[PDB]
Design a protein around this nucleic acid. Structure first.
Ligand SMILES: [Mg+2]
Ligand SMILES: [Mg+2]
Ligand SMILES: [Mg+2]
Ligand SMILES: [Mg+2]
Ligand SMILES: [Mg+2]
Ligand SMILES: [Mg+2]
Ligand SMILES: [Mg+2]
Ligand SMILES: [Mg+2]
Ligand SMILES: [Mg+2]
Ligand SMILES: [Mg+2]
Ligand SMILES: [Mg+2]
Lengths: 140, 351
RNA sequence: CAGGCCUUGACAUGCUAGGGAACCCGGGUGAAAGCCUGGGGUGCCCCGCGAGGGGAGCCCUAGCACAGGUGCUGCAUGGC
RNA sequence: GCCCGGAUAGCUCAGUCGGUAGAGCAGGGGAUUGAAAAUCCCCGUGUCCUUGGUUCGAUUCCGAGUCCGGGCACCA
């Protein structure tokens, strides 16, 4: 989340990104380019690792933008702890994953920034909610 | 080498469609187009087609370089440990296989095979008695089950008419190709000299689709009138609205009735007919609407074979492809994966 | 037919290279095939006691020309 | 709709007082034939229409039903 009157927030891929499939052209309708966010973009994705990179965009109408990178969505970061790829067509009590007690504090070393709370436990109980979103169990 | 063929059967779909995504992913980068509630949906269909056209051409050039690198035909460790690395990376090459076999508008449901004889007479009928067992094993090897709807012999030798229904996942898609008239050349048993003879017999293939039997013409499109009786009668034939007329508008059919001396016994007895004529003219369609869905090839004359079978010199001549197998006797056992392998190409290759 | 192996190969012929030129009992491993492997030593043509290797058998591995097929056609044929 | 008759082997039909079930053709295995017929010996062969009741047991007798075939539907 950044500013308005010419912005867009997406969760880019990881490794490669230039074509149009994921969102390649969607950022162009609201003003964009092909040579500004492809190679001169994966400088961050090459660092964030792989999987997902919730980095977004902000238009100015002159090929300029505020590429403020972000931490993988709490929706994905949970599939790593448990293992599942999707989560569940429908959450509830059943889910193809598992997450022990301190399993949620494994991400405590991940999500600490913009959550709202600097600490690890006053910000982890938030991801315990994404365990009631996708379904992913909470061993305990 | 069985993957230099298949591996490049999808290497031609690259350029043809490649530069096409350019003139499509270039209509997405502009909103001015979206204004069209549908010309912005249709484009997002082509935009999303770079799904099965950007994953294949990608993870297939890997199954061509991650194998032609460490593969010694001599038993090794860093070699026979690469085959199982491409056993499911070749078994998955089947993903592109069924893509040219499961992309039929109606290849799910069971298929129906009508093997009828033709030129060659007393022999030509024998031909169908073989092509039948030929398709019996085929479908009985791949797992599918069979249901002999009908089967009748005849005069000298062979079979007159044989109709069958076979089930099993993705069935029609496998027998649709083997559709046309098959020719045979062998020493006619039913001859004195034993001369070399030919025989023709057709094989039709149509999937089990619509089943039910219903026609509820709701009195929602009927115009019922009630004029005064005609003919004899009495002080009442002039007074009562006996005669009734029910009208069908989406067709143009009209039925009348003065058989009795009551309007209510005539409008229902006049309806008891419109139901009829309709079911006949509503079915006359099912005769013409299903006679072009099957196709056209079926003359059985000399000069129209899809595949030619020969026991003489012994070989099979697929006329549709240009291929000329040498195992005829072997095919008559159900072995048809390969002629259909080529048949699911020549056929579904023009559309 | 299922499974485990072998490629000038089970066999013919000529040829190629440093090997090598009769050669003999095992060890290991595996279902066997096979892969691998632990020792004796070559009459001799004989410059020649010698170093050496010309050396006839001629086995060992790589390479070449080829071998191989109860695969098809008995209406392409012989013979029977 | 009113009244009368039906439905029995796969096809067309015989039958029982209520305690069997039958025919002819078709179809299945042999025989002749060089081979198909024809012919020839051997055979299977039924929830007796749906459904309820009567009965010690109903294909059978009963009340309703689905379908088929006939005779009626006149004096205005
Ligand atoms: Mg006849
Ligand atoms: Mg009168
Ligand atoms: Mg009146
Ligand atoms: Mg002869
Ligand atoms: Mg009958
Ligand atoms: Mg009895
Ligand atoms: Mg009888
Ligand atoms: Mg007989
Ligand atoms: Mg006969
Ligand atoms: Mg019987
Ligand atoms: Mg009178």
């Amino acid at each position: 989340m950044k500013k308005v009157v010419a912005v867009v927030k997406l969760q880019l891929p990881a490794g490669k990104a230039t074509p149009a499939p994921p969102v390649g052209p969607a950022l162009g309708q609201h003003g964009a380019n092909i040579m500004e966010f492809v190679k001169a973009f994966n400088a961050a994705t090459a660092n964030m690792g792989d999987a997902i990179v919730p980095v977004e965009i902000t238009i100015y109408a002159d090929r300029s933008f505020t590429f403020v990178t972000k931490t993988p969505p709490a929706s994905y970061l949970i599939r790593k702890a448990a293992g599942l790829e999707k989560g569940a067509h429908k959450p509830g009590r059943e889910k193809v994953g598992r997450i022990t007690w301190e399993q949620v504090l494994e991400i405590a070393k991940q999500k600490m920034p913009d959550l709202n709370t600097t600490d690890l436990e006053a910000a982890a109980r938030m991801i315990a909610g994404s365990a009631r979103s996708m379904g992913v169990e909470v061993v305990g | 080498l069985a993957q230099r063929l298949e591996g490049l059967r999808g290497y031609l779909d690259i350029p043809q469609k490649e530069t096409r995504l350019k003139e499509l992913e270039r209509r997405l980068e502009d909103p001015s187009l979206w204004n069209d509630p549908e010309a912005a949906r249709k484009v997002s269909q082509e935009a999303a087609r770079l799904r099965r056209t950007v994953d294949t051409f990608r993870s297939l050039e890997s199954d061509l370089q991650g194998l032609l690198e460490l593969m010694e035909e001599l038993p090794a460790e860093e070699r026979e440990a690469l085959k199982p690395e491409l056993e499911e990376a070749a078994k998955k090459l089947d993903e592109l296989y069924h893509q040219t076999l499961l992309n039929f508008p109606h290849a799910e449901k069971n298929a129906i095979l009508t093997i009828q004889p033709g030129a060659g007479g007393t022999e030509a009928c024998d031909w169908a008695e073989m092509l039948l067992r030929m398709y019996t094993r085929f479908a009985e090897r791949q797992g599918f089950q069979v249901e002999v709807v009908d089967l009748t012999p005849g005069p000298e030798a062979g079979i007159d008419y044989a109709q069958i229904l076979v089930k099993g996942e993705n069935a029609y898609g496998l027998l649709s190709p083997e559709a046309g008239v098959h020719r045979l050349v062998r020493p006619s048993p039913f001859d004195a000299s034993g001369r070399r003879h030919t025989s023709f017999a057709g094989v039709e293939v149509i999937p089990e689709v619509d089943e039910e039997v219903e026609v509820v013409l709701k009195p929602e499109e009927l115009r019922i009138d009630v004029m005064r009786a005609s003919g004899p009668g009495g002080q009442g034939v002039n007074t009562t609205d006996s005669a009734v007329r029910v009208v069908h508008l989406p067709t143009g059919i009209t039925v009348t009735c003065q058989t009795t001396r009551s309007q209510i016994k005539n409008k229902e007895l006049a309806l008891k007919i419109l139901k009829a004529r309709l079911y006949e003219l509503e079915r006359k369609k099912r005769e013409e609407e299903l006679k072009a869905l099957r196709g056209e090839v079926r003359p059985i004359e000399w000069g129209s074979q899809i595949r030619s079978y020969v026991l003489d010199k012994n070989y099979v001549k697929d006329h549709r492809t240009g291929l000329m197998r040498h195992d005829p006797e072997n095919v008559l056992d159900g072995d048809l994966m390969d002629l259909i392998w080529a048949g699911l190409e020549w056929k579904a290759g023009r559309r």
